[PDB]
Design a binder for these strands. Structure first.
Ligand SMILES: [Mg+2]
Ligand SMILES: [Mg+2]
Ligand SMILES: [Mg+2]
Ligand SMILES: [Mg+2]
Ligand SMILES: [Mg+2]
Ligand SMILES: [Mg+2]
Lengths: 213, 89, 256, 90, 59, 251, 180, 226, 189
RNA sequence: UAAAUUAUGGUCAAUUGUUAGUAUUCAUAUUAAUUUUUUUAAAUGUUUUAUCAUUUUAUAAAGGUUUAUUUUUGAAAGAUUUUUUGUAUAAAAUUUUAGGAAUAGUUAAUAAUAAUUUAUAAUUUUGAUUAGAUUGUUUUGUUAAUGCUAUUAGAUGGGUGUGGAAAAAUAAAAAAAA
């Protein structure tokens, strides 16, 4: 927006400076890990946990915190939901999209995400695994989605998982997959104990961006 | 509470409450009248709310500022005294 | 069950995301403790950073404390090399030859036209700075990285005559870059971090070798002790690997 | 209702008289303006001590100065000869 | 209203409907066995009106 | 209610209370529900001022390789009826789905046909909408649609490529909401028109000997009502408007 | 949001709710009974002090003879007295800035004091509640409606800033010769 | 929050309203949004006294001994139809009888046409599920000569309060596409003779005289003798 | 007065289910084997079984398999009509059906009447096509129904259909067909 | 290492036993209490709503805790429309028993790891952990007075985790959407 081009412009015009001595690192502090509060808060690299009234020299970011969004199927106890889960890496500035995929694959802790091969895409357009972030103008503000193999097959009832509400889960598939790990047959402590949302939550029509009545 | 009269639309159900609030157009009209009256009240009422808000803010401006006057003079006095004591030191 | 219910190390809020997001819209996962892992752990070091215009040009000459023969340093670095090559022989192009070991006290860009005037003047001012300083006994233990893990070096511990060094350096810094305007890669009002560069990855190499020296090599030597050394000799050098089996030397000063 | 009231309000003469309760807030601040009778650093009661003393916050601090000029020797006759009674000036 | 709700064990008299849990809440534990399998030919015997209308259909 | 600051409550990995991510399914009617009212705006824009990638010629051709890094998001208008190379054809005859094109068809070009096209691999999509006849909007000379024969051979088509089962974002229609005026009503007074002299001004309001005919006498409703719509927070019709103004609800 | 509602002491909207100004006292023999005007939350606990924002005052509901004043042949003044201590700055703060609520009996008090117009619940059952119709009201309104800017200026002085700067104090505050 | 009643004015609790805003007051419960509702209890409540003296059979009772005279069956059917309209007519009961399932016709519920309230629905399309009398009904709301831009699921289609009137003019075949009717301000130039506005944003109806009588005879202004 | 705070969250908007407190305690072992016995008592399964974790209702698939294992009545079909009636119940009463009858299938079904029994059947199916499924008839509908009233020689039902044609919903009756039951001839050919 | 005055200022400290050679706070005294007496409490049905549902209504049951108990605004307050912000869960001090010994799902680093990650780990005689007693840091009584001697009550784990916050299963005396 405004900030992005204001700051970009500032950087560009600061690099074209003929006469500059350079900063004095005695006067340019880092950040603290020691501050009041229980929680550990991670901030921007231009921001600090103390009050610094003076504006620091624009620096170029050598690690860009990319976000990569996946579709996930959550078990909500009335059936399946499809919602969004982000992975966040720190990708070196000049890195190749191939290498970004690799970073992503190493940084997800959910067993339900990276199972098959996937392609990174911005606004639906696939990206070259061959080229740099520099060419595609990826600023960390950019919206980057992630498209799996079977994802265009989801409109069917096959690839989309089958919930024990409406479908048989058989001795075939009780020993395999999320179905196994879930423990459908109720135990005393009630099993993994997932989140539940009831049937009448959204009314008769499910959640939409457009008001349907 | 919300008053449910006897001539409200009766519900015939054994599984729930005996009378649903639904109105004879008369009752609705009546309600509108009484409501208008009360509106006449709360107009003045919350008018007085924002009056007192500005009153209090203003009096705060004046008194707090006077306090900064006096206090700053104090603070300056103490600071003078201290650096004097350090010359002496 | 083997510890705290929510381990305190796992409690992390990301404020670089957004106010409404993580409550409702989506949840963001990351391994957040790679980023939090600190300057002591990674082995990073904050060197005086160059202004952009100075950042563009290559350095030409540097100041160096010359290491004598029969060092503890050179010996132990040789042992370190052997150990490293036996572990991984991919290091072989990274490693600096034990003959080229020197301490780097500061780095500098000299234009080729005014060259003679500047070497004369520098050498003179340098001789004036160190006239009163007697030899320096410094301690070397620990490793650190410059340039995002591309340059791997031996630290100079401020436990010893190092103090004097810092004044000494900070004098030439204010002469060489302050007095006669010369490009020191940093600000002349700031002090350079003295170091012994051990392994390095140059721009040409970076394609076959990789973008960062993997920390698995030097992890175990990260805090290793290379010992004490006394230094009587200061040099101003132009960078050529060929001529003596050592860097081509444009000037010298004896500390005595 | 509002307008009728404003009318017959402004019509009567016993309005246009300031009402201390209706008009302002005397003191907005949570703390008092001057010291009232609360125990001292020694724990003594308000009645036991008078403010303005040694416990009170400190007041702080070649040629001739402007304080030199105004001053005058009592041997010389002053400015306008105010008839002081001799006894008082003793 | 209130008398209707009172039959429920609601602790606060809340106009909510809260059932109980009897010892036998389901048929098999109350002793009842299945449901008797209907004899099919017995209920496929044509009704009276149908035969009488066969009698006025053949005339 | 406002959205809260951060989630410190539940582990992130499990993600807990999350509004479901909305996905647009091309098999169903709902798809069109999203895409249609966009199209109309789009066409409206095309009727007034030029937009670069809207009008194009002779379809498009790309390799199998670069197919998905080029196509998705693409929207362009062609003169004739020709269906894209390598697409299985699905006719949209189902009435519900059709229904959403109502506004676009009555107050813009009449819709002759709708087509859902799916490729061999099934991973792409094309929404193909064939209009018949001239627009019921006026078209300007310097506008994009003025470069087309189908408007102003009376059939022409809109082609929209997209990926299936994606959120109703990455079908890109929102870049098109640029608003340019229809200059048709003022074209009458331009130096170009010869009917500009048949115009005469009303500067002064005419002298009125009458009052507005009083509205029909009010019949109070006879049935049971749900109570004040004010106190129930119902907008005046349950339709639109502010809850402070209760106009047009029963009283 | 309690599973089993505490049945006897219900309230709107959960806890602790809005700040409200209440009148309360421990119950005793009528002869000695006093009340307290208290700003406090909507949901009280066992002891009223846990949620107590401020203490607005004592109120004694016993008509008193005034023995403090000298016995006065003026008729009015020898009516009995009713004694109440209002803290009016915390009142104007809590009510004005913090936007309080009000129970009815405190409202009646604050009305007798001239802080608030009399309550909704004070009824001379002599008069009825009024009637209304839009077009008669409209005729009265078309008859008298003040000018736009006069009214805007009213709303300005009442709600926004009151103290303003007349020409003279401007002219008095602007810097003189050596910096002018 | 978003849109209060009389601004914030707190002088009573009821002073706010029976809801604070149209929007859901907790974000975790969406359905609490302010709608316009209908008395479901009464308007379902179908009369079982029309089913008296009938002998209904059942769906899966097909048996030869089970069923009855064709005459009996006929009067049973008539009593069942009489059972279903026993309150009012459901939309899918109106639409199945009209040509083309009543596409284009204007479905108004009773109360929408009386008082200053004026509203109806131009039906876009219909789905019958296996059961009639239930289903999904889409269309365009028209409120005081103002019309919706896109179709919407018609709410409370299943509640039997609905009336409509069959006009051949509005009928559309399943081939074409139901057009949204014109909003009288914009697409059709406004005219007084064809359409006059019942009530507008600042208007409200004058007082009916007998309500006034009742209220005064209540509050005890106008006397009332037994 | 909602049960929000009385029962587990997932039980929200739970209506019509019998004694719902049941489904709160099903995890406890005794309640659970009680359920095993219940399901077995309901039958239709080869194995010991229990309904899934938080589910109050039975699964869709299970009640479907209960419904399709439940033997239909009428095991003796004689007339083509009774065959077509059992098929009618197979197609259009199938558990959770989308599909709905067409007036033409009612024609086909009304053309197979022979004995009065069959007239009763087809008339009940017609009762289902009016009241249950809400289907509009055509012109020829009352022609078919009339001739089928005539085949079994019961004309009472025809005139009963005439005196009120609105509840049965015959929207078109050719006036001559009225005449036939109202006292006038010249109907066929 | 000198006195002081423009003279009582800055607002009250004041102790009461008739004993029995002598040494030592010890019977009978007063004040405060228990012995001691029905003049301050109270009864059940919480309540709306769109109907078998869904909105409103969050700290008095017991268990015995001495290195111990700590927190937000997303609810309401709350004002105009839609996005809109950051601040919080952490600590420090005070801790009883006449005769006194070891304690343990265990520390710290790594990290959204490890029922077998790594390490020369953590608590204790400056009194720990078990065990006994006991409701924690403005409340009383006695007294001229540094003391001695009281202070109630109230937060008791998890197991479809709702809710802004668990404080959620009789026991109000809190007007709970006309
Ligand atoms: Mg308790
Ligand atoms: Mg203990
Ligand atoms: Mg402590
Ligand atoms: Mg603590
Ligand atoms: Mg709010
Ligand atoms: Mg428990």
């Amino acid at each position: 927006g405004h900030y992005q081009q204001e700051a970009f412009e500032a950087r560009k015009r600061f690099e074209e400076s003929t006469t500059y001595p350079g900063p004095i690192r005695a006067a340019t502090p880092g950040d603290t890990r020691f501050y009041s509060g229980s929680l550990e808060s991670i901030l921007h690299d231009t921001d600090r946990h103390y009050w610094r009234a003076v504006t620091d020299d624009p620096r170029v970011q050598h690690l860009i915190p990319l976000r990569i969004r996946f579709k996930i199927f959550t078990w909500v106890t009335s059936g399946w939901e499809q919602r969004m889960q982000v992975v966040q890496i720190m990708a070196p500035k000049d890195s190749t999209i191939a290498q970004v995929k690799d970073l992503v694959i190493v940084e997800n802790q959910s067993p339900y995400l990276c199972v098959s091969s996937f392609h990174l895409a911005i606004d639906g357009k696939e990206l070259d695994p061959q080229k740099t972030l520099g060419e595609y103008g990826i600023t960390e503000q950019s919206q980057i989605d992630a498209i799996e193999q079977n994802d265009h097959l989801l409109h069917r009832d096959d690839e989309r998982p089958r919930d024990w509400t409406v479908d048989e889960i058989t001795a075939e598939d009780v020993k395999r997959s999320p179905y196994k790990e879930m423990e459908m047959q109720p135990l005393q402590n009630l099993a993994p104990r997932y989140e539940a949302r009831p049937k009448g939550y959204f009314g008769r029509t499910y959640y939409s961006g457009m008001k349907q009545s | 509470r919300q008053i449910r009269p006897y001539y409200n639309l009766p519900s015939k159900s054994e599984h729930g409450r005996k009378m649903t609030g639904f109105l004879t157009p008369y009752r609705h009209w009546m309600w509108k009248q009484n409501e208008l009256w009360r509106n006449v009240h709360e107009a003045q009422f919350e008018h007085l709310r924002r009056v007192y808000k500005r009153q209090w803010l203003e009096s705060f401006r004046v008194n707090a500022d006077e306090y900064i006057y006096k206090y700053n003079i104090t603070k300056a006095a103490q600071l003078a005294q201290w650096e004097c004591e350090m010359k002496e030191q | 069950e083997r510890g705290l219910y929510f381990p305190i190390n796992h409690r992390i809020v990301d404020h670089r995301i957004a106010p409404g997001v993580t409550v409702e819209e989506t949840d963001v996962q990351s391994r957040y403790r790679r980023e939090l892992r600190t300057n002591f752990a990674t082995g990073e070091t904050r060197q005086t950073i160059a202004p952009p215009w100075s950042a563009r040009e290559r350095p030409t000459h540097f100041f160096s404390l010359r290491l004598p023969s029969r060092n503890s340093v050179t010996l132990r670095v040789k042992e370190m090399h052997n150990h490293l090559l036996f572990s991984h022989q991919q290091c072989a192009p990274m490693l600096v030859s034990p003959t080229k070991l020197h301490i780097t006290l500061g780095v500098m860009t000299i234009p080729e036209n005014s060259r003679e005037e500047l070497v004369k003047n520098i050498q003179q001012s340098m001789s004036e700075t160190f006239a009163c300083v007697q030899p320096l006994q410094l301690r070397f233990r620990g490793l650190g990285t410059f340039d995002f893990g591309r340059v791997l070096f031996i630290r100079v511990v401020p436990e010893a005559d190092f103090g004097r060094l810092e004044r000494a350096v900070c004098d030439i810094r204010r002469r060489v870059g302050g007095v006669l305007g010369v490009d020191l890669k940093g600000n002349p009002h700031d002090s350079y971090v003295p170091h012994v560069t051990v392994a390095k990855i140059r721009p040409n190499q970076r394609q076959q070798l990789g973008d960062t020296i993997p920390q698995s090599l030097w992890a175990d030597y990260q805090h290793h002790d290379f010992g004490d050394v006394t230094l009587s000799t200061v040099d101003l050098c132009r960078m050529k690997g060929s001529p003596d089996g050592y860097y081509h030397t444009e000037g010298a000063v004896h500390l005595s | 209702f509002r307008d009728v009231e404003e009318r017959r309000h402004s019509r009567d003469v016993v309005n246009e008289l300031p009402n201390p309760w209706y008009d302002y807030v005397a003191h907005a601040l949570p703390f008092p303006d001057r010291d009232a009778g609360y125990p001292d650093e020694y724990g003594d009661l308000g009645q036991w001590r008078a403010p303005g003393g040694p416990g009170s916050p400190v007041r702080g601090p070649r040629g001739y100065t402007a304080e030199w000029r105004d001053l005058r020797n009592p041997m010389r006759p002053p400015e306008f000869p105010t008839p002081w009674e001799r006894k008082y000036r003793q | 209203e209130w008398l209707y709700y009172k039959q429920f064990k609601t602790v606060d008299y809340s106009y909510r409907v809260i059932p109980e849990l009897p010892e036998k809440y389901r048929p098999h534990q109350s002793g009842i066995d299945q449901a008797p399998l209907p004899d099919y030919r017995e209920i496929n015997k044509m009704p009276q009106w149908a035969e009488c209308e066969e009698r006025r259909q053949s005339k | 209610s406002r959205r809260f600051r951060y989630n410190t409550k539940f582990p992130a990995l499990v993600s807990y209370n999350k509004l479901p991510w909305e996905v647009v399914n091309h098999e169903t009617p709902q798809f069109h529900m999203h895409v249609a009212p966009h199209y109309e705006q789009l066409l409206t824009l095309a009727a007034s001022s030029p937009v670069p990638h809207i009008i194009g010629s002779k379809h498009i051709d790309v390799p199998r390789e670069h197919r998905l890094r080029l196509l998705p998001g693409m929207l362009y208008l062609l003169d004739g009826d020709t269906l894209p190379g390598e697409f299985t054809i699905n006719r949209v005859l189902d009435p519900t789905a059709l229904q959403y094109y109502g506004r676009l068809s009555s107050q813009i070009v009449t819709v002759e046909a709708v087509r859902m096209l799916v490729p061999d691999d099934l991973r792409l999509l094309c929404n193909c909408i064939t209009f018949k006849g001239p627009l019921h909007l006026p078209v300007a000379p310097y506008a994009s649609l003025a470069s087309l024969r189908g408007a102003s051979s009376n059939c022409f088509t809109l082609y929209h490529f997209v990926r299936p089962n994606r959120p109703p974002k990455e079908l890109q229609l929102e870049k098109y909401y640029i608003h340019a005026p229809c200059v048709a009503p003022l074209s009458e007074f331009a130096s170009n028109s010869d009917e500009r002299g048949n115009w005469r001004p009303r500067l002064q309001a005419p002298k009125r000997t009458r009052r507005a005919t009083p509205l029909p006498a009010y019949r109070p409703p006879q049935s049971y009502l749900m109570g004040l719509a004010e106190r129930l927070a119902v907008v005046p019709g349950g339709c639109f408007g502010r809850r402070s103004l209760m106009w047009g609800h029963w009283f | 949001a309690r599973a089993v509602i505490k049945r006897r002491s219900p309230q709107l909207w959960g806890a602790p709710g809005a700040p409200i100004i209440r009148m309360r006292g421990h119950h005793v023999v009528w002869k000695f009974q006093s009340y307290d005007l208290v700003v406090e939350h909507t949901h009280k606990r066992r002891n009223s002090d846990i949620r107590l924002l401020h203490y607005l005052g004592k109120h004694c509901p016993h008509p008193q003879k005034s023995l403090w004043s000298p016995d006065t042949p003026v008729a009015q003044d020898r009516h009995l007295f009713m004694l109440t201590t209002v803290d009016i700055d915390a009142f104007k703060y809590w009510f004005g800035v913090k936007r309080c609520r009000l129970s009815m009996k405190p409202w009646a008090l604050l009305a007798k004091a001239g802080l608030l117009p009399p309550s909704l619940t004070q009824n001379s059952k002599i008069m009825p509640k009024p009637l209304f119709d839009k077009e008669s009201l409209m005729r009265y309104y078309l008859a008298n409606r003040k000018d736009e800017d006069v009214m805007a200026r009213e709303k300005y002085l009442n709600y926004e800033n009151s103290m303003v700067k007349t020409e003279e104090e401007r002219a008095a505050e602007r810097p003189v010769a050596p910096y002018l | 929050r978003a849109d209060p009643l009389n601004g914030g004015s707190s002088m009573t609790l009821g002073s706010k309203g029976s809801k604070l805003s149209p929007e859901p007051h907790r974000r975790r419960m969406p359905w609490t949004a302010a709608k316009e509702y209908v008395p479901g209890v009464v308007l379902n409540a179908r009369d079982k006294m029309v089913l008296d003296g009938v002998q209904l059979l059942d769906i899966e009772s097909i048996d030869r001994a089970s069923q009855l005279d064709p005459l009996e069956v006929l009067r049973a059917v008539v009593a069942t139809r009489e059972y279903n309209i026993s309150t009012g007519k459901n939309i899918f009961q109106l639409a199945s009888q009209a040509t083309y399932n009543g596409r284009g016709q204007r479905f108004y519920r009773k109360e929408w046409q009386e008082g200053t309230y004026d509203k109806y629905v131009t039906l876009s399309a219909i789905d019958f599920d296996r059961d009639g009398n239930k289903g999904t009904a889409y269309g365009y709301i028209t409120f005081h000569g103002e019309t919706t831009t896109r179709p919407v699921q018609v709410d409370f289609a299943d509640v039997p309060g609905w009336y409509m009137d069959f006009v051949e003019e509005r009928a559309v075949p399943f081939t074409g596409i139901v057009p949204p009717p014109p909003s009288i301000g914009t697409d059709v130039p406004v005219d007084p003779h064809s359409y006059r506005l019942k009530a507008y944003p600042y208007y409200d109806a004058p007082n009916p005289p007998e309500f006034v009588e009742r209220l005064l005879k209540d509050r005890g202004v106008l006397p009332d003798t037994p | 007065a909602s049960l929000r705070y009385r029962r587990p969250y997932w039980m929200m908007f739970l209506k019509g289910v019998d004694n719902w407190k049941i489904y709160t305690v099903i995890q406890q072992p005794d309640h659970q084997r009680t359920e095993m016995l219940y399901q077995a008592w309901l039958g239709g399964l080869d194995r010991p079984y229990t309904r899934p974790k938080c589910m109050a209702n039975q699964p869709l698939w299970l009640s479907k398999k209960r419904h399709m294992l439940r033997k239909e009545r009428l095991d003796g079909p004689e007339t083509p009509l009774e065959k077509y009636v059992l098929e009618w119940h197979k197609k259009f009463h199938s558990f959770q059906g989308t599909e709905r009858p067409t007036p033409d299938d009612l024609h086909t079904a009304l053309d197979l009447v022979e004995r009065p029994l069959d007239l009763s059947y087809a008339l009940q199916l017609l009762g289902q096509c009016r009241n249950l499924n809400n289907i509009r008839f055509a012109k020829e509908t009352f022609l078919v129904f009339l001739e089928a009233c005539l085949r079994v020689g019961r004309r009472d039902c025809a005139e009963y259909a005439l005196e009120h044609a609105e509840p049965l919903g015959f929207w078109f009756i050719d006036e001559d067909h009225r005449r036939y039951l109202q006292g006038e001839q010249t109907w066929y050919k």
